[PDB]
Amino acid sequence: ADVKGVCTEAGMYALRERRIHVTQEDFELAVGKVMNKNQETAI
Amino acid sequence: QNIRDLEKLYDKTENDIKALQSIGQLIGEVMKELSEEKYIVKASSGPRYIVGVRNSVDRSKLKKGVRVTLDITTLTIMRILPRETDPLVYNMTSFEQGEITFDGIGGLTEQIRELREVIELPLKNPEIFQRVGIKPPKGVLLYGPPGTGKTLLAKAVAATIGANFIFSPASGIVDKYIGESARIIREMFAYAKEHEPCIIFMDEVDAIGGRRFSEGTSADREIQRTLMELLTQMDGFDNLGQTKIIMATNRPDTLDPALLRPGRLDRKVEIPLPNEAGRLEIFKIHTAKVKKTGEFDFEAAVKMSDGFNGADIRNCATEAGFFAIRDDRDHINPDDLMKAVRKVAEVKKLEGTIEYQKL
Amino acid sequence: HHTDCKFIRVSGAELVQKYIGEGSRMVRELFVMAREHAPSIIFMDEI
Amino acid sequence: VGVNKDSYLILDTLPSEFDSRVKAMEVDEKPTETYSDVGGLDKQIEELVEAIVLPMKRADKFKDMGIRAPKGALMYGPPGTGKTLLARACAAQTNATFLKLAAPQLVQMYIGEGAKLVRDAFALAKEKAPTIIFIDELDAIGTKRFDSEKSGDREVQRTMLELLNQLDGFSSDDRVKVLAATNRVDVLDPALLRSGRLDRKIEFPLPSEDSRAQILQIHSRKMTTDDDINWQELARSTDEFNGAQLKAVTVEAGMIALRNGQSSVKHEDFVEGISEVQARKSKSVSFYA
Amino acid sequence: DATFIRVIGSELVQKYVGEGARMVRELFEMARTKKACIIFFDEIDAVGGARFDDGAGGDNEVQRTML
Amino acid sequence: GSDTGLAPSHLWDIMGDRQRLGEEHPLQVARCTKIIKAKYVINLKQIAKFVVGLGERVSPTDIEEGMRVGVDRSKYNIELPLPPRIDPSVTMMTVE
Amino acid sequence: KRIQSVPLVIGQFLEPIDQNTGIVSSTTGMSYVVRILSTLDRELLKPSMSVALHRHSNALVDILPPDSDSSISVMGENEKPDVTYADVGGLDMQKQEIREAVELPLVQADLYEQIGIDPPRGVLLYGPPGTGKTMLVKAVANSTKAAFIRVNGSEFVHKYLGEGPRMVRDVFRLARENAPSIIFIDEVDSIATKRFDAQTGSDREVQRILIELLTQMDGFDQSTNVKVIMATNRADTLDPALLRPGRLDRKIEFPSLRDRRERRLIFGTIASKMSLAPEADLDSLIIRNDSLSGAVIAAIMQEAGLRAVRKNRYVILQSDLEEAYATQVKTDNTVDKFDFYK
Ligand SMILES: Nc1ncnc2c1ncn2[C@@H]1O[C@H](COP(=O)(O)OP(=O)(O)OP(=O)(O)O)[C@@H](O)[C@H]1O
Ligand SMILES: Nc1ncnc2c1ncn2[C@@H]1O[C@H](COP(=O)(O)OP(=O)(O)OP(=O)(O)O)[C@@H](O)[C@H]1O
Ligand SMILES: Nc1ncnc2c1ncn2[C@@H]1O[C@H](COP(=O)(O)OP(=O)(O)OP(=O)(O)O)[C@@H](O)[C@H]1O
Ligand SMILES: [Mg+2]
Ligand SMILES: [Mg+2]
Ligand SMILES: [Mg+2]
């Protein structure tokens, strides 16, 4: 489920810059955010 | 005055006949203006209708909410009746009066100040609340041990200060039928908006104040709907215009935390057990109407009445009066107050050791 | 889906009765209702 | 107000209508007990009559004293010592409405029905003032309030708080005395035990030594007793016998006398009944003393 | 030769609060309607719990029916 | 030539029209209330709370508060008092 | 056109069975199968409409402007709430999430379709009581250009059986007409509780209300650009049927703030509007890290202002801010009253 979350967050990140395509570095941003949330909510 | 009074009786009988000719009309609520002669009116029965209006009713004063009268046969709007007051609201605001004033309350002087800074100050000085910038408080949750003045304070507030008081019992809102446990609260809060300022005062709210269950029964689920309805009409998608809510209970622990949040229930004035000098005021107040027959130095009673709570001191006065009667004496004696104090103090052990936490 | 079997996903008797909107004393009420629509698969989750 | 079916004209007003259960609970025939049938209670009788009856016939003395008459008297005690019989005698002697009320009768089906019933009870009491309500077995609704998130009895607490608000609060009317005869005073909520609400807490103790003789004498009137029964000996024979445990002794003695064919009871039948009722309900087996 | 109304202890335990009290009240009214009746309250171990407090208000409905 | 009696037993005579034309058979049941000194207040379960007089078929002293009245359907009247309502679940607990 | 007299009963069209017959549900409570008048614009007989019915026949005779039967009304200007995004201090991530799940989907759906993501059609603002769940939505309504139909949860339930699902469908129809629009069903935990009693009329009506809500929300196609927002204090007491894709998926998690930066931001936001003295430091107030909520840290400043007013000072000082912390936040009790546990 985190993979789907990563993909959806990357799609949202592409929107945030008002862009048209999803990039690899936006994927990096999304995976970083998903990891941070997953490791935080484990508390 | 035979002929004249007989004519008066004739006028009464004629009025009875005129009433006999008259007919009733249903009451509904206008919710739309489809055209100049087509309105969508609700009915107290429940069904909606498409009703044609008369020719004399001013069409301008027909918006969502105005009560109107409907002819029973053809369902035609007749009158422009003003807003409604639910009978279970007049039966609440029409309490007797109360003869006790702020003098009758003893010991409680700091908490009286704290309560009055929210009940009287916003209603009579809304300018310091502006330049300072404070948001005017709404709720005052009086709480303390059972029998210290949490209700007598409300009676004093009703008699003193002013504003349209609405005394509210806890269970006096809950009805068997679905939703009526919340419609009553809705009309209670609607009446206040048309009678500003209002000092709506619930009481014993730990009936509908309980921590909402997660696996309660059907009964405890309909009450939670009432708690939601009450909760929203304090901080919901609307501002309480000029309504102050006073709220009293004996067990603040069993109160829903959403209701206890600072912002819905503001400054939580706590009424504690009377302490020494406070108890002397209670003894002086409650033993002033009684026919005192001595140098009533209540210092011994003050020392012995440890942990006594308000009404208990009145019970010592009552028991002293009883003891005076036991010897047929017509006025209490300073050594008969002592017996009553001892007797009440012995019974005080029957009560549970009153414990409570400062919220 | 590919085997073409109706996929029931009961997750609690109270939720089943609430969703179907009918009273029931024990959970086998889903069994008679599922026998009519066969083949079928009952999927129960966990936490 | 009565109103016509079709014209909806107000034909005539009507008296206030309470719940039909409230009309039934009003006592109609006065139970014939009198204070002469209750024995062993002298302090308790004097305390109750001087707290619930006296401020109803000669309230002018209290008004001259400028003192508030007590609301009601609690009647806690061990089971079977007269907590209910005293109420029967009080209803016999009094000259005011004596609405009886069993506490479980208050607890009802739907949300708020119990509160409505217990409010209508006090409304009816105020209507036919003065009154003496007799909420009985108060521990049925007077259980302590408690915090709980799992589940609770939040329905009965509604009736409890409604009763509290009717006893004291904005409405008093100060002319409706409320008696209550619980059995477990250790369970009652602290609010219900407060002053302003039930003030007098009359303790009903187990009968004294002479009290037992008085009880035996009272409950052996109808039966055909003999002229040689030593009531003092019987009273001493019973030790910590609580009230109805003596009426049971009388009944058992009569039953034994009837079984043995005697036309009238004797001291021996009374002693046999004492052994029958007592913790010797097993009896038999005189082995090893 | 008299009516012999039988009562199993578990039958006096309904779901909704206060229904056991109505159960017993209606039962006793029916018994009083007849000239001579015998009631056989059986397995009163069910509704027989001694009054006790535990903070959580344990099985207080059965206690209500019993009182 | 599932819901009937027994044709071989007959006993389903066609004289039921005689006990059928008497439209007094439909009688609203309702528990009486406060006895206004004579007018009676009737509390039809959920249709109304009518105030009604007698129906000449019952003695005025036969109706008391708490009794169930066979109220007439049209132009309501107190026709026939009925035995007090008993819960069905308390009925089979009677050994016959 | 004579049956269109002016006694009439408002009904709700449910299903077109034939060209000249339909299944309407009159407000009296019970459904009918009626004959449709052969003059109405049959292209307007959308499901859950607000058609009118003849009095004693129930034959469909007139279709109404579908924004007429609504008992709930679109929030206009007299009820326009008076809070701002600037006034709502803190909640930066929550603000961004609600903006990207509520406002942006309303404005630009083409970007969502082109990117490939699924536009959210429901948010479930939840958290501990006193965290701004209501206020953030309140600030949204003060800046949105879309209709803000505001229903209030328990307002759905009424004695009149059938006044539930009917008004639910009516509210959703009103939302669909004034698109774009935001529904703000509030305190939904009173309608969507998990446990259920299939014997009493209380639960069997809330059940129909929830079923109608769920069906209408599932009926949301890719278009109609109407978003649903509901807030609750207890997330656990919620039907899991409300937490599925196509229904409420995005879940905002309003936390009881513990970060120093968040408390600093919100304290400064509240202080800016008020009359803090120049020699008054909020940093001295926020030295200790508690579980302070977003609401208590405003009532504390209200209490400080009241304390200053009591001493006749018309500008609050540091000595009153210090005392305010001691009276509005003492303990949560728990075990901190017993030091030996740690
Ligand atoms: N400060 C006081 N001075 C004099 N009498 C007092 C005082 N406080 C309480 N009383 C007495 O208390 C009685 C009124 O009820 P009281 O205020 O004790 O109830 P409460 O604590 O509000 O009740 P509840 O437990 O139902 O919330 C009166 O008899 C009044 O004399
Ligand atoms: N002092 C007494 N004089 C005469 N009879 C007495 C006395 N005390 C008890 N009894 C007998 O007790 C029986 C009734 O007991 P009672 O109802 O008062 O007990 P209780 O414990 O208060 O009951 P409950 O708690 O169920 O209300 C009667 O048969 C009565 O004769
Ligand atoms: N970020 C914030 N900045 C300033 N004040 C805030 C903030 N969040 C909440 N508040 C305070 O919260 C109060 C309004 O209640 P709020 O909207 O926070 O309730 P809520 O958390 O939505 O409650 P509930 O769950 O009961 O509906 C106001 O007094 C306001 O000062
Ligand atoms: Mg009080
Ligand atoms: Mg008794
Ligand atoms: Mg809120």
PDB file of N, CA and C in Angstrom, chain G residues 268-305:
ATOM      1  N   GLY G 268       1.539  33.648  18.303  1.00  0.00           N
ATOM      2  CA  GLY G 268       1.754  34.932  17.658  1.00  0.00           C
ATOM      3  C   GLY G 268       0.545  35.390  16.867  1.00  0.00           C
ATOM      4  N   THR G 269      -0.113  34.457  16.174  1.00  0.00           N
ATOM      5  CA  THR G 269      -1.303  34.808  15.406  1.00  0.00           C
ATOM      6  C   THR G 269      -2.399  35.358  16.310  1.00  0.00           C
ATOM      7  N   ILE G 270      -2.631  34.709  17.451  1.00  0.00           N
ATOM      8  CA  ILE G 270      -3.649  35.190  18.380  1.00  0.00           C
ATOM      9  C   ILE G 270      -3.225  36.516  19.006  1.00  0.00           C
ATOM     10  N   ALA G 271      -1.941  36.651  19.347  1.00  0.00           N
ATOM     11  CA  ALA G 271      -1.467  37.855  20.021  1.00  0.00           C
ATOM     12  C   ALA G 271      -1.522  39.072  19.107  1.00  0.00           C
ATOM     13  N   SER G 272      -1.324  38.871  17.802  1.00  0.00           N
ATOM     14  CA  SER G 272      -1.287  40.001  16.878  1.00  0.00           C
ATOM     15  C   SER G 272      -2.602  40.771  16.886  1.00  0.00           C
ATOM     16  N   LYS G 273      -3.731  40.059  16.895  1.00  0.00           N
ATOM     17  CA  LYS G 273      -5.022  40.735  16.945  1.00  0.00           C
ATOM     18  C   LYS G 273      -5.255  41.411  18.289  1.00  0.00           C
ATOM     19  N   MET G 274      -4.752  40.825  19.375  1.00  0.00           N
ATOM     20  CA  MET G 274      -4.982  41.373  20.706  1.00  0.00           C
ATOM     21  C   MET G 274      -3.970  42.453  21.061  1.00  0.00           C
ATOM     22  N   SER G 275      -3.929  42.828  22.336  1.00  0.00           N
ATOM     23  CA  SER G 275      -3.195  43.990  22.822  1.00  0.00           C
ATOM     24  C   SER G 275      -2.095  43.566  23.782  1.00  0.00           C
ATOM     25  N   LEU G 276      -1.253  42.633  23.349  1.00  0.00           N
ATOM     26  CA  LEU G 276      -0.092  42.255  24.144  1.00  0.00           C
ATOM     27  C   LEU G 276       0.814  43.458  24.379  1.00  0.00           C
ATOM     28  N   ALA G 277       1.289  43.596  25.613  1.00  0.00           N
ATOM     29  CA  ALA G 277       2.215  44.666  25.937  1.00  0.00           C
ATOM     30  C   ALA G 277       3.576  44.396  25.297  1.00  0.00           C
ATOM     31  N   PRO G 278       4.330  45.449  24.970  1.00  0.00           N
ATOM     32  CA  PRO G 278       5.663  45.232  24.383  1.00  0.00           C
ATOM     33  C   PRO G 278       6.590  44.428  25.276  1.00  0.00           C
ATOM     34  N   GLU G 279       6.498  44.598  26.591  1.00  0.00           N
ATOM     35  CA  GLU G 279       7.313  43.833  27.534  1.00  0.00           C
ATOM     36  C   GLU G 279       6.597  42.563  27.987  1.00  0.00           C
ATOM     37  N   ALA G 280       6.123  41.783  27.018  1.00  0.00           N
ATOM     38  CA  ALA G 280       5.446  40.519  27.285  1.00  0.00           C
ATOM     39  C   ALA G 280       5.943  39.494  26.279  1.00  0.00           C
ATOM     40  N   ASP G 281       6.488  38.387  26.773  1.00  0.00           N
ATOM     41  CA  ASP G 281       7.139  37.389  25.934  1.00  0.00           C
ATOM     42  C   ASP G 281       6.322  36.104  25.929  1.00  0.00           C
ATOM     43  N   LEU G 282       5.870  35.698  24.740  1.00  0.00           N
ATOM     44  CA  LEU G 282       5.198  34.412  24.597  1.00  0.00           C
ATOM     45  C   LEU G 282       6.195  33.259  24.625  1.00  0.00           C
ATOM     46  N   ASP G 283       7.450  33.524  24.251  1.00  0.00           N
ATOM     47  CA  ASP G 283       8.476  32.490  24.316  1.00  0.00           C
ATOM     48  C   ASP G 283       8.673  32.003  25.743  1.00  0.00           C
ATOM     49  N   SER G 284       8.556  32.903  26.723  1.00  0.00           N
ATOM     50  CA  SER G 284       8.581  32.486  28.119  1.00  0.00           C
ATOM     51  C   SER G 284       7.384  31.610  28.462  1.00  0.00           C
ATOM     52  N   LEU G 285       6.258  31.803  27.773  1.00  0.00           N
ATOM     53  CA  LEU G 285       5.087  30.968  28.007  1.00  0.00           C
ATOM     54  C   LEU G 285       5.231  29.586  27.384  1.00  0.00           C
ATOM     55  N   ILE G 286       5.943  29.477  26.268  1.00  0.00           N
ATOM     56  CA  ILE G 286       6.023  28.223  25.528  1.00  0.00           C
ATOM     57  C   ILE G 286       7.333  27.479  25.805  1.00  0.00           C
ATOM     58  N   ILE G 287       7.959  27.719  26.960  1.00  0.00           N
ATOM     59  CA  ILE G 287       9.221  27.046  27.263  1.00  0.00           C
ATOM     60  C   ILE G 287       9.027  25.542  27.433  1.00  0.00           C
ATOM     61  N   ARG G 288       7.893  25.111  27.978  1.00  0.00           N
ATOM     62  CA  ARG G 288       7.662  23.702  28.266  1.00  0.00           C
ATOM     63  C   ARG G 288       6.765  23.080  27.203  1.00  0.00           C
ATOM     64  N   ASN G 289       7.101  21.855  26.802  1.00  0.00           N
ATOM     65  CA  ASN G 289       6.411  21.157  25.718  1.00  0.00           C
ATOM     66  C   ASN G 289       5.308  20.293  26.319  1.00  0.00           C
ATOM     67  N   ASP G 290       4.074  20.776  26.222  1.00  0.00           N
ATOM     68  CA  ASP G 290       2.903  20.035  26.656  1.00  0.00           C
ATOM     69  C   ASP G 290       2.182  19.458  25.439  1.00  0.00           C
ATOM     70  N   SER G 291       1.006  18.879  25.673  1.00  0.00           N
ATOM     71  CA  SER G 291       0.127  18.395  24.610  1.00  0.00           C
ATOM     72  C   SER G 291      -0.952  19.419  24.294  1.00  0.00           C
ATOM     73  N   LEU G 292      -0.580  20.695  24.363  1.00  0.00           N
ATOM     74  CA  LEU G 292      -1.533  21.789  24.248  1.00  0.00           C
ATOM     75  C   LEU G 292      -2.258  21.759  22.909  1.00  0.00           C
ATOM     76  N   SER G 293      -3.582  21.850  22.964  1.00  0.00           N
ATOM     77  CA  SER G 293      -4.399  21.816  21.764  1.00  0.00           C
ATOM     78  C   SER G 293      -4.408  23.181  21.085  1.00  0.00           C
ATOM     79  N   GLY G 294      -4.955  23.213  19.871  1.00  0.00           N
ATOM     80  CA  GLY G 294      -5.071  24.467  19.154  1.00  0.00           C
ATOM     81  C   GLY G 294      -6.158  25.384  19.669  1.00  0.00           C
ATOM     82  N   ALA G 295      -7.004  24.902  20.577  1.00  0.00           N
ATOM     83  CA  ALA G 295      -8.081  25.699  21.148  1.00  0.00           C
ATOM     84  C   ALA G 295      -7.762  26.214  22.543  1.00  0.00           C
ATOM     85  N   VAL G 296      -7.143  25.384  23.387  1.00  0.00           N
ATOM     86  CA  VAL G 296      -6.814  25.807  24.744  1.00  0.00           C
ATOM     87  C   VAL G 296      -5.816  26.958  24.729  1.00  0.00           C
ATOM     88  N   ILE G 297      -4.965  27.028  23.707  1.00  0.00           N
ATOM     89  CA  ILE G 297      -3.913  28.037  23.674  1.00  0.00           C
ATOM     90  C   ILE G 297      -4.468  29.339  23.115  1.00  0.00           C
ATOM     91  N   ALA G 298      -5.783  29.395  22.951  1.00  0.00           N
ATOM     92  CA  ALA G 298      -6.499  30.640  22.717  1.00  0.00           C
ATOM     93  C   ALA G 298      -7.384  31.023  23.890  1.00  0.00           C
ATOM     94  N   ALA G 299      -8.033  30.039  24.514  1.00  0.00           N
ATOM     95  CA  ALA G 299      -8.776  30.318  25.733  1.00  0.00           C
ATOM     96  C   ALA G 299      -7.851  30.755  26.858  1.00  0.00           C
ATOM     97  N   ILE G 300      -6.590  30.320  26.833  1.00  0.00           N
ATOM     98  CA  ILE G 300      -5.633  30.803  27.822  1.00  0.00           C
ATOM     99  C   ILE G 300      -5.398  32.298  27.655  1.00  0.00           C
ATOM    100  N   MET G 301      -5.275  32.767  26.412  1.00  0.00           N
ATOM    101  CA  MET G 301      -5.096  34.195  26.191  1.00  0.00           C
ATOM    102  C   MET G 301      -6.365  34.970  26.510  1.00  0.00           C
ATOM    103  N   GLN G 302      -7.530  34.375  26.256  1.00  0.00           N
ATOM    104  CA  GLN G 302      -8.774  35.001  26.695  1.00  0.00           C
ATOM    105  C   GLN G 302      -8.810  35.141  28.213  1.00  0.00           C
ATOM    106  N   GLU G 303      -8.379  34.101  28.929  1.00  0.00           N
ATOM    107  CA  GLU G 303      -8.333  34.160  30.386  1.00  0.00           C
ATOM    108  C   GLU G 303      -7.341  35.210  30.863  1.00  0.00           C
ATOM    109  N   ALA G 304      -6.195  35.320  30.190  1.00  0.00           N
ATOM    110  CA  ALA G 304      -5.228  36.354  30.544  1.00  0.00           C
ATOM    111  C   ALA G 304      -5.812  37.744  30.333  1.00  0.00           C
ATOM    112  N   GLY G 305      -6.532  37.939  29.228  1.00  0.00           N
ATOM    113  CA  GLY G 305      -7.190  39.214  29.003  1.00  0.00           C
ATOM    114  C   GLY G 305      -8.223  39.530  30.065  1.00  0.00           C
TER     115      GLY G 305
END
